[PDB]
Automatic annotation (TrEMBL), chain C:
Assembly and oligomerization: Part of the 30S ribosomal subunit. Contacts proteins S3 and S10.
GO molecular function, one term: structural constituent of ribosome
GO cellular component terms listed in the entry, alphabetical order: cytosolic small ribosomal subunit
UniProt KW keywords: Ribonucleoprotein, Ribosomal protein, RNA-binding, rRNA-binding
Pfam family, one: Ribosomal_S14
Function: Binds 16S rRNA, required for the assembly of 30S particles and may also be responsible for determining the conformation of the 16S rRNA at the A site.
UniProt organism field: Escherichia coli
Classification via InterPro entries: Ribosomal_uS14, Ribosomal_uS14_bac/plastid, Ribosomal_uS14_CS
Family of this protein: Belongs to the universal ribosomal protein uS14 family.
RNA-binding keyword on record: yes
The protein, known as: Small ribosomal subunit protein uS14
Alphabetical GO biological process terms: ribosomal small subunit assembly; translation
Automatic annotation (TrEMBL), chain F:
PROSITE patterns the UniProt entry points to: RIBOSOMAL_S13_1 (PS00646), RIBOSOMAL_S13_2 (PS50159)
GO BP, one annotated term: translation
The protein's name: Small ribosomal subunit protein uS13
InterPro entries membership: Rbsml_uS13_C, Ribosomal_uS13, Ribosomal_uS13-like_H2TH, Ribosomal_uS13_bac-type, Ribosomal_uS13_CS
Length: 79, 127, 101, 151, 98, 114
RNA sequence: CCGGCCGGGAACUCAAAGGAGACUGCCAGUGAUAAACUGGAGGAAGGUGGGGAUGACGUCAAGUCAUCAUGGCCCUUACGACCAGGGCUACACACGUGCUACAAUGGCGCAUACAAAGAGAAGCGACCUCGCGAGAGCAAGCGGACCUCAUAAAGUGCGUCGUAGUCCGGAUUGGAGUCUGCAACUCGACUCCAUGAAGUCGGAAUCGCUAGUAAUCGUGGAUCAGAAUGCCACGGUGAAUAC
RNA sequence: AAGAACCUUACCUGGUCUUGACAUCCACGGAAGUUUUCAGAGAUGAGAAUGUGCCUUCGGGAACCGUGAGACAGGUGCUGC
């Protein structure tokens, strides 16, 4: 819907993702960049996205690619 | 030879040159029937021309800018009445006992602060 | 009026005019529809994070110069509405009298 | 008002053959300030009624109006206590205007095809005194003639 | 030839500024065109007179910018330099273009 | 007049009739008629069957009632399967595009019964 | 090449200044021969011509020490300071303010004519090429009565729609795209593809308006990187009633 | 509030800083400034190359930056009774 030219990601996030990928399965990676998209190469990681006070781990899937990380971090808890 | 009236009504401003000849009206390189003669208020310019006939006395080269259809037409009317000066008060005494000389400014009032369109308050409510 | 926020804002202005307005080509010229469609533009947007979260012109709130108020600001005089009225009535602003028509 | 004893305004005569009453009729036809369209509808209905009944534009209206022209209206004038109705004669300047208002109100409803057709049918109906404006006139005359005890 | 455009805020100052700048160039540099009106620019502003609620109360100010063209026709020696280094009667932005 | 599934229209122009099909509106209908060589002023009462055949073999190019319905259902089901914010709003029955839920947003929330 | 495009002028429109005029000025009647009211003549304007700013001693021990200044109470290894993310946009509900409508004096497609006031330079952005489109690429003019914003809409004519929840209505929804911004999920706007809702004039009750006012239609500006149906201002058509 | 994506922000979670981000005094050492790499959510810590004048009281000065104590700074914290 926006940013026609290339997805957006953070330097720390991309570096840590490539490192963990070339290293193998690792503990959940604590991330704070909900503004970032999801590459196809990150499928399998259990990264933990910040929701505002805690970090929710999410298992990246092949469908969870075009969307961002914040789409799966419910912030406002109602009832 | 050729006399002049200015004319203006509601943001309009005209220039009516009046010359003895045919009974035609050439306004802004367009005729009166195709300028606004097809809409309503078709004879707001011909109204002050039956008490003193126009069919075969003289024609008018007219220009007008500013305002809208009826505004420019009333400006043309006032310009005609002001240009009828080579036939001076000798005819205006009759032209005035039916109007056609009152400038009739009555401009649109400015929008007031806190209001909506200078009179419509913003929907008062008690509680 | 939160001298902390005022110092923060002047720091933003300094850092922004220092970094951007001079190196804006990294996002204005390289991000172009040309032969740079390859990893060049990817590395361009990658280095676009080289600069801190600040340094951008959109984080400039344009507060008042006397008080530092964020709301009611006029880009013409650089002051908020309260202070611009005060100065106008005291006679500081030239040509600015009460309008009536 | 309370102190202003000002009178009525002098409206502009009709752009067609000179007439003030049908000019007022046109003035009371207009919504959103569109006067050109109201004049077009009025002229259409006038021609449709003149060609159908045989009379002309100015005469036809007159016959129809007088059939819806009320005699007396009831209005609340309480005098120290009870609040009752008082039937009274209405001025002519308001009488004709109210007749035309009832005409236009009856024409707003009863949608045949268009506004001009609506109004021409309503005028034809008031001509023989069997329309809806005449029904409103009769409702007013029934409200009167029953509470005439208060005078 | 010499396009002199002068703008100010107060008319009862800019008018006499134009009068002096025109007679100090026509008495020796005549064939001038005079103070063309160049209509005024009115920058209006509507602010709130209160720092809080009661928005309906607003103050309306404006600044007028009166302009004038002198439009000297001939670039004379009695004109080109006689226009310069004579910048008194301040409060008026004058712009000379060749 | 047995085009895609429905499209039974009587005394309506070609485009106003094709708008009866779930999957083709106004611009798409005009494009269908432009590619078939049909005018937008004729009705189904006058259009011959030799041209109903062109309508058939042309409207088949775009997604249709069943295909479009199943695509929409599959998209909504994929969202509810991923469980994103959009899927959560879909399951809770609330607007998705950030509309006002405090006072407005009554259509997607349901009638104002309570 | 009929574009005031070019010579040519300060007549005309517009334009910024300085003046005139409208001030119960004159007449008739009424009124305590006073004030004043009514009517009339000239006049564009009759009686504070139209509109605006201008807000009396004081009341509400009203609102703001969160715009700002300051008495005192407190923290002053903190209630001070920096930063990533989130929220101020959350929703079983109630209310206020507006927009959109509920359709035929109207919706849709086409051809046409008439405005005022304003903004503009790390911005307005001609012209040309691409797309149904939002916009993109090259790139003149303009710190401005020349350049841009910027095509004014209602209105006029033509053809369709036959009173149907219907071509009125546009809410919500899935994919894709355009623009600002470092990043548009939470949380922007915009055009297109499909969808089409409730709604058929609204209970008690309640608000605005007496003139270019209401009603209706469109345009600009401040805020702003982007982001208004709000605010301010401008202009077109333009009523009814006031016993 | 003449316009909350971040900013604005004065709120919450989390990580930090502390005579302190903003202002003045003493003493000490370093021209200021510029490019760049590592870890990190960033704040930050650790670094690597460069640059050395405006006047000579010339035990250095007029700026800028690193640190120690004390006077202090700061508060959109309360009180419009």
């Amino acid at each position: 819907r926006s940013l026609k030219k290339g997805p957006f990601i953070d330097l720390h996030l991309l570096k840590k993702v490539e490192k963990a990928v070339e290293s193998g399965d690792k503990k959940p990676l604590r991330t704070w960049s909900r503004r970032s998209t999801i590459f196809p190469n990150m499928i399998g990681l259990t990264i933990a996205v910040h929701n505002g006070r805690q970090h929710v781990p999410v298992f990246v899937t092949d469908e969870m690619v075009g969307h961002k990380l914040g789409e799966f971090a419910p912030t406002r808890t109602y009832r | 030879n050729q006399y002049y009236g200015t004319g203006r009504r509601k943001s309009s401003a005209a220039r009516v040159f009046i010359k003895p000849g045919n009974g035609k009206i050439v306004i802004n390189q367009r005729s009166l029937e195709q300028y606004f003669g097809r809409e309503t208020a078709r004879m707001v310019v011909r109204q002050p021309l039956e008490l003193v006939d126009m069919v075969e006395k003289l024609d008018l080269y007219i220009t007008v800018k500013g305002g809208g259809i009826s505004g420019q037409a009333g400006a043309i009317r006032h310009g005609i009445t002001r240009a009828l000066m080579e036939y001076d008060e000798s005819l205006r005494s009759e032209l005035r006992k039916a109007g056609f000389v009152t400038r009739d400014a009555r401009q649109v009032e400015r929008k007031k602060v806190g209001l909506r369109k200078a009179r419509r308050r913003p929907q008062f409510s008690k509680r | 009026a939160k001298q902390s926020m005022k110092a923060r804002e002047v720091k933003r202005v300094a850092l922004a005019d220092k970094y951007f307005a001079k190196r804006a080509e990294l996002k204005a010229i390289i991000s172009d529809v040309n032969a740079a469609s390859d990893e060049d533009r990817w590395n361009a947007v990658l280095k676009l994070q080289t600069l801190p979260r600040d340094s951008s012109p959109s984080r400039q709130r344009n507060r008042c110069r006397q008080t530092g108020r964020p709301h009611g600001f006029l880009r013409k005089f650089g002051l908020s509405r309260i202070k611009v009225r005060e100065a106008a009535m005291r006679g500081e602003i030239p040509g600015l009298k009460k309008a009536s028509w | 008002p309370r102190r202003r004893v000002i009178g009525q305004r002098k409206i502009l005569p009709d752009p067609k053959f000179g007439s003030e009453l049908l000019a007022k009729f046109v003035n009371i036809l207009m919504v959103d300030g569109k006067k050109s369209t109201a004049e077009s509808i009025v002229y259409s209905a006038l021609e449709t009624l003149a060609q159908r009944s045989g009379k002309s534009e100015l005469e036809a209206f007159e016959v129809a109006l007088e059939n819806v022209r009320p005699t007396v209206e009831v209005k609340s004038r309480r005098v120290g206590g009870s609040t009752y109705q008082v039937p009274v004669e209405v001025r002519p300047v308001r009488r004709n205007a109210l007749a035309m208002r009832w005409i236009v109100e009856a024409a707003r409803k009863r949608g045949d095809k268009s506004m001009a057709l609506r109004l021409a049918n309503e005028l034809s109906d008031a001509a023989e005194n069997k329309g809806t404006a005449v029904k409103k006139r009769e409702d007013v005359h029934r409200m009167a003639e029953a509470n005439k005890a208060f005078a | 030839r010499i396009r002199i455009r002068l703008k100010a805020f107060d008319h009862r100052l800019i008018d006499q500024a134009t009068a002096e700048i025109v007679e100090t160039a026509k008495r020796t540099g005549a064939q001038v065109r005079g103070p063309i009106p160049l209509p005024t620019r009115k920058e209006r502003f509507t602010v709130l007179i209160s720092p809080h609620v009661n928005k309906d109360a607003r103050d309306q100010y404006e600044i007028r910018t009166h302009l004038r063209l002198v439009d000297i026709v001939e670039p004379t020696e009695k004109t080109v330099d006689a226009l310069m280094r004579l910048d008194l009667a301040a409060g008026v932005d004058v712009q000379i273009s060749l | 007049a047995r085009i895609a599934g429905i499209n039974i229209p009587d005394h309506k122009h070609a485009v106003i009739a094709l708008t009866s099909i779930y999957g083709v509106g106004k611009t798409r209908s005009k494009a269908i008629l432009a590619a078939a060589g049909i005018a937008e002023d004729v009705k189904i009462s006058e259009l011959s069957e030799g041209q109903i055949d062109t309508l058939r073999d042309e409207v088949a190019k775009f997604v249709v009632e069943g295909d479009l319905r199943r695509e929409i259902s599959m998209s909504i089901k994929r969202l509810m399967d991923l469980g994103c914010y959009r899927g959560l709003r879909h399951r809770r029955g609330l607007p998705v595009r950030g509309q006002r839920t405090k006072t407005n947003a009554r259509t997607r929330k349901g009638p104002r019964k309570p």
